[PDB]
DNA sequence: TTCAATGAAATATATATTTCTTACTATTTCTTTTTTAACTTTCGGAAATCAAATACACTAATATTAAAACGCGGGGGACAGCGCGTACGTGCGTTTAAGCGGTGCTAGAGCTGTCTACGACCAATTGAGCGGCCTCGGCACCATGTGACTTAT
């Protein structure tokens, strides 16, 4: 049954504590974003521990948002998180908006 | 009978296992020198009393009056069951880019010496505003000297 494997990997990710997004692509993403903010005279410089810090905060925020979306999904009688549910979570928590 | 084959016991040896020993390294502790906290007066300014004296928010009493509570009904909406369907999950199969380890190198972080330069603090001048006093010019009044006129010597 798909539910058995799904719940098994839910268990392993409930007691998992590793990063889930690829390090080199994430570093490139923040790299190119902060070059986008920059003037043409220079280029910024970054450090690995800063990269881990930003990624850690990013996924803290993401896990909070996703669990709130799951709670909205339970409210809406649907086990599927959908576009309107995610919109509602973003609005209600209303950070930097 | 005499000799040969076999069995039993002691012994020598091979082997595997355990323990001692030793090398290497990481951890803990002793030692010396350096920063950073610690102890001592000092003085000024903040903070703890003491006496007013004036806003200030209940607590009383009371009518109009808007607001709130009870009751019956009805039509709207929440809820539930059945049914068609699809969109997300899965099952494999490749293949793609992530992860890790070396390679260089150059832009850039970090500590130090130095000079310049803002800036806090203090001193003194200046401007501005408000009266207050001084000073000069002006009507009301009496005082005054001279000309005109008259009289008698």
Swiss-Prot record:
Gene Ontology molecular function: centromeric DNA binding; protein heterodimerization activity; sequence-specific DNA binding; structural constituent of chromatin
Post-translational modification: Ubiquitinated. Is degraded through ubiquitin-mediated proteolysis when not protected by its association to the kinetochore.
One GO cellular component term noted in the UniProt record for this chain: 2-micrometer circle DNA
Region ranges (H3-like): 1-97
Effect of residue 44 to S: In CSE4-102; impairs nuclear division by disrupting the core centromere structure
GO biological process: 2-micrometer plasmid partitioning; kinetochore assembly; mitotic cell cycle; mitotic sister chromatid segregation; protein localization to CENP-A containing chromatin; rRNA transcription
Subcellular location: Nucleus; Chromosome, Centromere
Consequence when changing residue 62 to Q: In CSE4-111; impairs nuclear division by disrupting the core centromere structure
Keyword set, alphabetical order: Centromere, Chromosome, DNA-binding, Nucleosome core, Nucleus, Ubl conjugation
Keyword DNA-binding applies: yes
Record annotation: effect of changing residue 65 to S: In CSE4-110; impairs nuclear division by disrupting the core centromere structure
Record keyword Metal-binding present: no
Function, in words: Histone H3-like nucleosomal protein that is specifically found in centromeric nucleosomes. Replaces conventional H3 in the nucleosome core of centromeric chromatin that serves as an assembly site for the inner kinetochore. Required for recruitment and assembly of kinetochore proteins, mitotic progression and chromosome segregation. May serve as an epigenetic mark that propagates centromere identity through replication and cell division. Required for functional chromatin architecture at the yeast 2-micron circle partitioning locus and promotes equal plasmid segregation.
Family the entry assigns: Belongs to the histone H3 family.
Quaternary context: Component of centromeric nucleosomes, where DNA is wrapped around a histone octamer core. The octamer contains two molecules each of H2A, H2B, CSE4/CENPA and H4 assembled in one CSE4-H4 heterotetramer and two H2A-H2B heterodimers. Interacts with the inner kinetochore. Interacts with the central kinetochore protein CTF19. Interacts with YTA7.
Miscellaneous field: Mutation in CSE4 causes chromosome non-disjunction and cell cycle arrest at mitosis.
Record protein name field: Histone H3-like centromeric protein CSE4
